[PDB]
Amino acid sequence: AAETFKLFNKYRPETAAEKKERLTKEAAAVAEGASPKPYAVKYGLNHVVALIENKKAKLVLIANDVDPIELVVFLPALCK
Amino acid sequence: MPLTAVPEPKRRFVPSKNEAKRVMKIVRAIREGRIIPPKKLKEMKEKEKI
Amino acid sequence: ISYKKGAASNRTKFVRSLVREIAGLSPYERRLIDLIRNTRAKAKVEEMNNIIAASRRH
Amino acid sequence: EYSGIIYVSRLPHGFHEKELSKYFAQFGDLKEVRLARNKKTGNSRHYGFLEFVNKEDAMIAQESMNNYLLMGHLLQVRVLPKGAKIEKLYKYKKRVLVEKGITKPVKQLKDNMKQKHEERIKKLAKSGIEFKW
Amino acid sequence: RSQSEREEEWLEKLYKKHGDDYKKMFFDKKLNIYQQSEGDLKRRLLRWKKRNG
Amino acid sequence: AIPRERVIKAVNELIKFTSKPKNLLEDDEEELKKDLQLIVVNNKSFTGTSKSFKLKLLNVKHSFYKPWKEASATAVKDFKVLLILKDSDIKKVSEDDLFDQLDSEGIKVDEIICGKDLKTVYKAYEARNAFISQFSLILADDSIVT
Amino acid sequence: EKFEELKLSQPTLKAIEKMGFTTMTSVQARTIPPLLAGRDVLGAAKTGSGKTLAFLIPAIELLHSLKFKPRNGTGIIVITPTRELALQIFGVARELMEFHSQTFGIVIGGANRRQEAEKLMKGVNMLIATPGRLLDHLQNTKGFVFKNLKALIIDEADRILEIGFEDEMRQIIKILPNEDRQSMLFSATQTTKVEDLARISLRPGPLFINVLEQGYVVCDSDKRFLLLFSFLKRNQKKKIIVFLSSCNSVKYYAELLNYIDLPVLELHGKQKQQKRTNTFFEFCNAERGILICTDVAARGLDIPAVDWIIQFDPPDDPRDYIHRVGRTARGTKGKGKSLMFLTPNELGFLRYLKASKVPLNEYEFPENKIANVQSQLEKLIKSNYYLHQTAKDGYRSYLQAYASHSLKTVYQIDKLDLAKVAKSYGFPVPPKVNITI
Numbered sequence: 029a030a031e032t033f034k035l036f037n038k039y040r041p042e043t044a045a046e047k048k049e050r051l052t053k054e055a056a057a058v059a060e061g062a063s064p065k066p067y068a069v070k071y072g073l074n075h076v077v078a079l080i081e082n083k084k085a086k087l088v089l090i091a092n093d094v095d096p097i098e099l100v101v102f103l104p105a106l107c108k
Numbered sequence: 109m110p111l112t113a114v115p116e117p118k119r120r121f122v123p124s125k126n127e128a129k130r131v132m133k134i135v136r137a138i139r140e141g142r143i144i145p146p147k148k149l150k151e152m153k154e155k156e157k158i
Numbered sequence: 159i160s161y162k163k164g165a166a167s168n169r170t171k172f173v174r175s176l177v178r179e180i181a182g183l184s185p186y187e188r189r190l191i192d193l194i195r196n197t198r199a200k201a202k203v204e205e206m207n208n209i210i211a212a213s214r215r216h
Numbered sequence: 217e218y219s220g221i222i223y224v225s226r227l228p229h230g231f232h233e234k235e236l237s238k239y240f241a242q243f244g245d246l247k248e249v250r251l252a253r254n255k256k257t258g259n260s261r262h263y264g265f266l267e268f269v270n271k272e273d274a275m276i277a278q279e280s281m282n283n284y285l286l287m288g289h290l291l292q293v294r295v296l297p298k299g300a301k302i303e304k305l306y307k308y309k310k311r312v313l314v315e316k317g318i319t320k321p322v323k324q325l326k327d328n329m330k331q332k333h334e335e336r337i338k339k340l341a342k343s344g345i346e347f348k349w
Numbered sequence: 350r351s352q353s354e355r356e357e358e359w360l361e362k363l364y365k366k367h368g369d370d371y372k373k374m375f376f377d378k379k380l381n382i383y384q385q386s387e388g389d390l391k392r393r394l395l396r397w398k399k400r401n402g
Numbered sequence: 403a404i405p406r407e408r409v410i411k412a413v414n415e416l417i418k419f420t421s422k423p424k425n426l427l428e429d430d431e432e433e434l435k436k437d438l439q440l441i442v443v444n445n446k447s448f449t450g451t452s453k454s455f456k457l458k459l460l461n462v463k464h465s466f467y468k469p470w471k472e473a474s475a476t477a478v479k480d481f482k483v484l485l486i487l488k489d490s491d492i493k494k495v496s497e498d499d500l501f502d503q504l505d506s507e508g509i510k511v512d513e514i515i516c517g518k519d520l521k522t523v524y525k526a527y528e529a530r531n532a533f534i535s536q537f538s539l540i541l542a543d544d545s546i547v548t
Numbered sequence: 549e550k551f552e553e554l555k556l557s558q559p560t561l562k563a564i565e566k567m568g569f570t571t572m573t574s575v576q577a578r579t580i581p582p583l584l585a586g587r588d589v590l591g592a593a594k595t596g597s598g599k600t601l602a603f604l605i606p607a608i609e610l611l612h613s614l615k616f617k618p619r620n621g622t623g624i625i626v627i628t629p630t631r632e633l634a635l636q637i638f639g640v641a642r643e644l645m646e647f648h649s650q651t652f653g654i655v656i657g658g659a660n661r662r663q664e665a666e667k668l669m670k671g672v673n674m675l676i677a678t679p680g681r682l683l684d685h686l687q688n689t690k691g692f693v694f695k696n697l698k699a700l701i702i703d704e705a706d707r708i709l710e711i712g713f714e715d716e717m718r719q720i721i722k723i724l725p726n727e728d729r730q731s732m733l734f735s736a737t738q739t740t741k742v743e744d745l746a747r748i749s750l751r752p753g754p755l756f757i758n759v760l761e762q763g764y765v766v767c768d769s770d771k772r773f774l775l776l777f778s779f780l781k782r783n784q785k786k787k788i789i790v791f792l793s794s795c796n797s798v799k800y801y802a803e804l805l806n807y808i809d810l811p812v813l814e815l816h817g818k819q820k821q822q823k824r825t826n827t828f829f830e831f832c833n834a835e836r837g838i839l840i841c842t843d844v845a846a847r848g849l850d851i852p853a854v855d856w857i858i859q860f861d862p863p864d865d866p867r868d869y870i871h872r873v874g875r876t877a878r879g880t881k882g883k884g885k886s887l888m889f890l891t892p893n894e895l896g897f898l899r900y901l902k903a904s905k906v907p908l909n910e911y912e913f914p915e916n917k918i919a920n921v922q923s924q925l926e927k928l929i930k931s932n933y934y935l936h937q938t939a940k941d942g943y944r945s946y947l948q949a950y951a952s953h954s955l956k957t958v959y960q961i962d963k964l965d966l967a968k969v970a971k972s973y974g975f976p977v978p979p980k981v982n983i984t985i
Binding site: 049051052053054055056058059063081082083 | 109110111112123127130131132134135138139143145146147
Binding site: 113118 | 981
């Protein structure tokens with residue numbers, strides 16, 4: 029678990045403030061006068077479930093304390 | 109092999125379009141003086157706090 | 159004709175069978191399985207027989 | 217049954233006899249710790265053996281480190297069957313070269329080179345190549 | 350319905366680098382950032398040429 | 403030094419010997435059967451008692467990598483060139499600059515890498531081997547080579 | 549024997565001129581005039597002898613004269629034995645109706661069931677189809693109007709009965725109308741079953757028209773294309789003709805090889821007729837280069853003298869492939885060496901080579917000399933949308949042509965590892981393709 033969160037913490041998505049700052053810098057550059065695809069951890073239940081059944085996820089972390097536990101009971105079986 | 113044969117959308121291969129529209133909106137706001145650019149803001153915080 | 163009677167999608171059958179395998183068996187279905195090993199009713203018994211056959215080998 | 221000897225494999229760089237002993241002495245008293253190295257230059261071969269005084273300490277040392285993700289490596293620790301002694305694992309060091317020789321006199325050493333040249337010239341004649349001088 | 354400044358600059362660059370070769374403008378990774386078909390490129394470039402000359 | 407006639411006859415004899423007389427692609431033995439090598443032996447070691455990883459550059463009259471790249475068109479492995487540069491000098495030069503000042507002579511720099519790329523993206527042994535083994539000429543910055 | 553000689557419509561002449569055909573060959577010179585008279589033909593012309601236009605032009609002319617509409621249903625039904633040949637016939641027919649107002653459609657195995665059903669719903673005036681799916685669409689789809697059938701054409705009846713569609717053909721004959729229908733049959737050869745089918749589908753008394761070892765390489769399904777690329781790159785100076793199973797795979801391979809700086813030419817049934825003629829004429833005089841084409845598209849064409857003929861994909865007609873290794877050597881006076889890529893699962897094909905008594909030679913390839921461009925190909929497929937789509941289409945077509953092969957004892961799809969097949973197309977994970985496995 030400690031080694032898994034060292035890899036997953038290097039692909040943390042940008043926060044609202046950082047994304048806004050990055051977009052405003054580009055906007056200010058344009059207002060005066062070719063990038064690679066980003067990388068981040070995928071989240072959201074529906075998004076990850078859609079990724080799993082399309083065979084795109086390389087590794088899926090499932091929380092063990094979802095209060096309506098039926099939200100994630102099918103997930104280990106779907107992943108296997 | 110996957111469950112469905114839905115084709116891959118073209119928006120997954122090219123840069124973001126929502127961000128392009130948002131950047132152009134910020135550009136339009138900057139040109140109207142509603143948003144002070146970060147360089148000008150950095151200039152204004154080195155001139156008063158004395 | 160309408161879509162409502164078209165067919166069953168691959169994903170739909172996949173989801174139904176996965177939920178069947180995960181949820182378990184209701185008590186009367188356990189009784190039916192025990193009885194078998196030792197129109198609604200026909201479908202239910204055919205489902206139980208399919209479950210038995212899939213549990214055996216595949 | 218089982219022995220008190222555990223074989224450890226897929227060791228990272230810089231995890232040698234002293235490091236292995238220091239880490240595995242916390243699971244019990246040790247009796248022998250040896251690491252495989254290259255003979256020509258002292259360099260870890262990334263596996264080794266070590267024996268516990270208590271046989272039941274080796275089982276605990278094996279159950280907790282058999283799939284340890286360390287330095288990008290999956291340590292492979294396993295207990296050996298009954299008997300299965302560990303031996304012949306020397307702690308080699310880097311072998312420096314010694315420049316010694318020229319025992320033969322310069323006259324004989326210089327005369328042998330001529331006959332080597334002549335024999336070399338004659339050698340290629342039987343290999344479908346014509347070469348003069 | 351007139352084009353924008355940035356679109357006109359992009360079409361400027363495309364025309365100045367390739368001319369009327371739509372197949373190369375389609376496969377160019379630096380100017381066709383949003384990979385667009387030959388038909389769309391031809392239509393927009395024709396509009397640009399008609400407006401300019 | 404060496405009379406020209408002896409070297410000429412040696413090369414002619416090697417050419418004759420190398421071609422005396424199922425498989426889709428030539429194997430290692432057949433691929434490099436015609437490679438030419440000059441063996442030079444002195445008294446005692448060449449570089450003393452210290453290992454030298456530097457290459458001695460001997461001047462040649464005729465280009466050595468031009469026929470290589472020309473004859474690499476009909477080979478499974480292309481002739482690629484790698485240029486390793488310093489961290490601070492990786493942004494001062496682009497592929498366009500080397501294209502402008504090198505295509506007029508026939509030279510193509512296939513890849514330009516930094517020293518930071520050798521410790522992040524090609525750190526793993528397999529990836530490093532796969533990347534490095536595809537180049538036939540590696541030119542390193544004078545400061546970074548050591 | 550010119551096209552302008554026969555009295556035809558204006559759109560027909562426009563289309564014929566556009567494709568570039570001026571001097572009709574003998575097969576289409578001694579059959580089209582009798583066909584415009586309305587009689588029945590039991591031909592014997594070989595496949596690719598120009599008979600396609602010979603049985604097409606009367607159909608378009610009849611539809612134009614009767615002035616069909618989409619709500620009239622189908623008027624012409626063409627029956628073909630193989631999935632890839634029906635695609636070629638449909639591609640040819642798309643160009644004879646560029647200016648006409650009729651409607652054309654294709655019904656083949658492995659395609660979308662509901663899409664074909666809806667195309668039938670809208671009303672298709674000329675249907676080109678395989679026997680297997682015709683029965684399903686006739687007996688199952690409601691709203692497929694076919695009572696207005698005016699003509700029926702059977703292509704390669706010998707192939708149809710060889711594959712085993714004779715029961716399907718009998719049921720189809722029992723379903724389709726018979727009175728207003730003037731029918732047509734073509735077969736290169738004729739056995740008892742051929743006239744058995746001809747009698748129950750044609751009017752009585754119809755006019756009839758009369759017209760060096762082989763090598764193989766055992767390769768893995770995840771390395772077939774990479775080894776092929778290595779071989780082609782190593783042998784660029786020679787002349788090589790590469791045969792593929794489908795048109796989509798031909799176009800994907802040609803586009804990929806041109807993208808990686810390896811000049812090749814392409815022929816497939818989804819191209820213009822003028823484009824095909826231009827490329828094939830170019831290939832016959834360039835004394836260098838590689839041409840990639842489908843098996844069926846290179847049947848009628850007279851193959852020139854080339855240094856290598858590679859059969860990358862399983863042959864559509866193995867019975868013809870066994871004979872062609874000697875036929876093309878009888879024709880071409882040069883040493884045209886043949887090669888055939890076989891995967892370990894389909895290695896039983898050699899039996900047919902041994903039983904038919906042809907010399908057999910095996911080729912080896914070192915494992916470490918392969919091109920090692922898999923990473924580049926996979927990076928390119930994930931980035932270029934157009935190349936991604938073309939690769940997926942080629943994968944689809946390859947699987948669809950592999951599933952419906954006549955030699956089920958050799959080319960069975962159940963023993964094909966789809967992950968390794970998609971690996972050769974640049975895909976880490978196989979795309980989903982709706983095939984019964």
